[PDB]
Amino acid sequence: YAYLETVVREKLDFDSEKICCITLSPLNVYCCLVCGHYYQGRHEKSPAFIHSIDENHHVFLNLTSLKFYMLPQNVQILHDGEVQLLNSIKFAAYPTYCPKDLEDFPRQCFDLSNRTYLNGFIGFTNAATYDYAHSVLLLISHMVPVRDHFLLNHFDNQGEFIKRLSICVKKIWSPKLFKHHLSVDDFVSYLKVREGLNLNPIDPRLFLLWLFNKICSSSNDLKSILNHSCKGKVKIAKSESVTGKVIVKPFWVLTLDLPEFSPFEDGNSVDDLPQINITKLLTKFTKTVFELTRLPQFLIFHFNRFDRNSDHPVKNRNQTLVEFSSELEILHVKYRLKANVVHVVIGDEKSHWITQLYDNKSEKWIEIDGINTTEREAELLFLKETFIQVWEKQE
Ligand SMILES: [Zn+2]
After folding, report:
1. CB-based contacts of 17, cutoff 8 Å, min separation 6
2. What does the entry list as the binding residues for Zn(2+)?
3. 230 is in an annotated binding site
4. Is 51 annotated to bind ligand?
5. Do 59 and 178 sit in the same domain of this protein?
6. Is 181 known to sit in a ligand binding site?
């Protein structure tokens, strides 16, 4: 254990692509726990073994089996579980939870630089590229029954996609992060390279639908939980008694169409701009007849901002001001707002996506924009352009 004082936790990032930085191989990759680079190991002549002699760095983590090794001794560090430093590092690579930990989530935590964060309510690097994916991962990680299943189970038997996704969800909730933000560049890049994710354009709705469908085709357990918790159903219906066509359509996400909008009208006050209350968008179902015949525990709405089959879809998007508060009722079933994905503008204008999430325990809204988090007031959330919302059914 003499070498454990050489470990430098601040250099360790386990969100990176798991490849050897010398051979670019993904096979048998180790992380050097002194400098944090990855090396294929661990036999003589391997990059990790050579690194250990030439750079004088001797403590490694096998990134696949999570066992610790001394090199060039080439011996496993046993009882790594009794060693605080080692527990800490193994937890950074693969957070573990028991049911009672979840009872005190979320809570204020501190990263290694003593920056405080509320666990589960953290941001992500490279929002310029992956903001649409950050919002979707946060949404699904904050649906308690889905989150709990990912945090408390292991997924070595359900294929590479489900294992990688489970690890993202486990890190999103980690109360012991070394730094208070995550990278999911490699996860999203893996989806494009190996799981055929190739939508262009893409946005939080298209990616949420893709990700729910991919989860369902990959895991029978998660399929049954998403089907039960998230999947709604709409029924559309119209001397000789005709019964008339009845379609029952399941949905993950219910699209609410906004009133016709002209991008060329300008004004200098909010009362000059079009507005509509969310309850009025739902009139369709609460007044051919449309009915929500299955109301899920989590009801996800999409506000149809974009006409993608016309020129400059972002610039010409429907900017009707959608008004909502934190509660809603649909034919006597009450819901409370839990998540709000907002569209921000930064050839066409470019979309940027930010995610606001509700914490029941402290009763605060936290807005996650890139790695920044800011509290927001509930009554003013609707002033930004809402795109997707998650509502949770109340007893
Ligand atoms: Zn090193």
Report:
1. 186, 189
2. 32, 35, 51, 57
3. no
4. yes
5. no
6. no
